[PDB]
Amino acid sequence: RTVARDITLLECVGKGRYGEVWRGSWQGENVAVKIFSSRDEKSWFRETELYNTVMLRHENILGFIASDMTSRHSSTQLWLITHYHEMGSLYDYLQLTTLDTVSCLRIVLSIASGLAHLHIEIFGGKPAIAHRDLKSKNILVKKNGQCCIADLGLAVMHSRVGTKRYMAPEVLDETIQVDCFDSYKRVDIWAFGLVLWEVARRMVSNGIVEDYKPPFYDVVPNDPSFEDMRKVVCVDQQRPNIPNRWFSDPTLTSLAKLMKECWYQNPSARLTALRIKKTLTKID
Numbered sequence: 001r002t003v004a005r006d007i008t009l010l011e012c013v014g015k016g017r018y019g020e021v022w023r024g025s026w027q028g029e030n031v032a033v034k035i036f037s038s039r040d041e042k043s044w045f046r047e048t049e050l051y052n053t054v055m056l057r058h059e060n061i062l063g064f065i066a067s068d069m070t071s072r073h074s075s076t077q078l079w080l081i082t083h084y085h086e087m088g089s090l091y092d093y094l095q096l097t098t099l100d101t102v103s104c105l106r107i108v109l110s111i112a113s114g115l116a117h118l119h120i121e122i123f124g125g126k127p128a129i130a131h132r133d134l135k136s137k138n139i140l141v142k143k144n145g146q147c148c149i150a151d152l153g154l155a156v157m158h159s160r161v162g163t164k165r166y167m168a169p170e171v172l173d174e175t176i177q178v179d180c181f182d183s184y185k186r187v188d189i190w191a192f193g194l195v196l197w198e199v200a201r202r203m204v205s206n207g208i209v210e211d212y213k214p215p216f217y218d219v220v221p222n223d224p225s226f227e228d229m230r231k232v233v234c235v236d237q238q239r240p241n242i243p244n245r246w247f248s249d250p251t252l253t254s255l256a257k258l259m260k261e262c263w264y265q266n267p268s269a270r271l272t273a274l275r276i277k278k279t280l281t282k283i284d
């Protein structure tokens, strides 16, 4: 049997410290090709080890196609191949679009569904998984209006560190119980609540919308330091602003309440992904 392995790389859609992401062609179909830097090889090994353990298949998790290691003259090339979402990341999408009630709820419920699927242990099945780097750049927008969660390079299974802007207080003040798997679920719930805030800002009510901003845009610099974030989140205990205009809208009022219950200083007081899913389904 012939095995057609050739991928044509067509355009670069992402470049960073991690490496690059390319739109590629395989047998007439779009694929996304993440090429890792040597600096970030451990992210390729973690994501590969996870998918070798459990082949995740969920509509709100970026679809795995392949992990490839190729031998080069004086180096190894590490590639992760996934489904391609031509609408790009939620971060990208929120900059140039506003949302209505239905599209805002569809986005956040799809993210909650993906996250609950990661978090749940299923017997027979999958281990429980914490993402550890949830943010709007690690969420992709699909044509059907739902999103999917990407990048399991920092993920931890039960049975590089997170982006500083989205770190929970217990990460910033180094009190997180590192031995306790539920601590990592609670870290993801904090980051989820910041994503919920980013999205809700872009939902129109009464002819009003907020400009896209990243969480804590008004209180920390670009590329905030660990110390910058610790002072805001742990010492001053600041939380993202809820604008007055949200309290005229039943959807945004319910989402504000949800956000608050993701941001408790005490990690054990935070809602579970499954409770967020239920709350979101009952809105509107």
Ligand SMILES: COc1cc(-c2cncc(-c3ccc(C4CCN(C)CC4)cc3)c2C)cc(OC)c1OC
Pocket: 002, 003, 004, 005, 006, 026, 065, 066, 068, 081
């Ligand atoms: C090695 O590398 C890559 C390969 C492929 C690829 C292309 N055609 C066919 C296949 C294939 C799948 C499954 C079987 C078998 C399974 C069990 N058996 C009992 C019956 C049938 C055979 C062949 C593959 C795996 C795609 C890749 O990327 C998109 C690869 O990596 C770049």
Ligand SMILES: COc1cc(-c2cncc(-c3ccc(C4CCN(C)CC4)cc3)c2C)cc(OC)c1OC
Pocket: 026, 065, 066
């Ligand atoms: C990596 O991804 C893709 C792979 C393929 C692909 C290519 N050749 C053969 C296969 C295949 C055939 C048969 C089995 C099974 C059937 C039942 N039992 C006997 C066990 C073995 C498995 C695999 C596949 C899945 C196509 C894709 O898309 C069109 C892929 O995605 C881009």
Ligand SMILES: COc1cc(-c2cncc(-c3ccc(C4CCN(C)CC4)cc3)c2C)cc(OC)c1OC
Pocket: 013, 014, 021, 032, 033, 034, 080, 081, 082, 083, 084, 085, 086, 087, 088, 089, 092, 137, 138, 139, 140, 150, 151, 152
């Ligand atoms: C976050 O993480 C990963 C993401 C992806 C991924 C999958 N589909 C589509 C994309 C994408 C496409 C296009 C744009 C822009 C560029 C062109 N124009 C300016 C508007 C649209 C942005 C994003 C990506 C980046 C793949 C990954 O791995 C192979 C990722 O890593 C796990």
